[PDB]
Amino acid sequence: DNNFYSVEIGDSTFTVLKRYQNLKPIGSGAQGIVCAAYDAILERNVAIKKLSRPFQNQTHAKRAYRELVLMKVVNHKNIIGLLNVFTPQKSLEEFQDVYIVMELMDANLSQVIQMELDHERMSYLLYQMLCGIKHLHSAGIIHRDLKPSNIVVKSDATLKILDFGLARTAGTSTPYVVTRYYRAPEVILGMGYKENVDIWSVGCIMGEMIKGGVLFPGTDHIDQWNKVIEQLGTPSPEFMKKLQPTVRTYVENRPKYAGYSFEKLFPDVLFPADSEHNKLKASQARDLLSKMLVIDASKRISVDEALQHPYINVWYDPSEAEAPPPKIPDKQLDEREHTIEEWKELIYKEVMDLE
């Protein structure tokens, strides 16, 4: 009879439109288990992300709202596409679950990191990640959690970013929320953050792609800092000064480190043959690597700079790279405290709009 239905996936219940069929578990977001599904109507695979009673908490509601808002507003071929949203509940009183339907790519980067890319591919993927990020920044939005598993590819070599639950404007104003291995110094050390925090993440991702494995493993949130300095060497005192004193003391206390050169961090052995023409060179990759993986955010290259970089700009196209900003209605401001129930209200209104 009715519009929705139900399937047990392990201990999770998916209640979804009858159009969606054959659900399979695939992964998680900050919030959400996610299923792959057939959309019998549109006749294509999709991804359904269940957000479970997200109003149950400041956190969950904050993240859910953003994710709802940003997914509606964002539009770029390198951001993952909105397709549908719904709740199966029939009212603000009944309400508990949100569901988001998105396009399904073929794989996340996990994945590619292991295979051995030629330069044109490696540079192309980066270029696509960056246009994606420039799209968010373009509107003041920082992704904060870029990592191989938030970046999805397809076998035509296209690429999109994913999961906006973490996404907000600039820093300070909780610490262990961004994935450990991709944490920038400004995040490890508690000093707050600007858009180029995303650039640090890209640097790590690129590094891994080449490295074959995680660039700064780091066995806990503190060792993490060791890995960073073990490699890049001890930041400047100019830098340390901006460190809060409690943390400043620890840092200044570490064994000093010269740090390896990028040629040593990233030898030729590791790179493919150099490509047909000029800018896709192992050394150009190094140069770029060296401008992203910089401890001091104020000496770190931006997205627009990164797109300009000779290794990335060989694909440069203004209609991808200088699109119109997603438009955020000044209502939603990624920070406000609401309540227990002001939240349940907001999301509902927002899902309601979107159904």
Binding site: A107, V112, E120, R121, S155, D156, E276, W315
Partner: peptide, 10 residues
Amino acid sequence: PKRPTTLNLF
């Protein structure tokens, strides 16, 4: 320099 159009996820 052409954009690749294949990517092997075998």
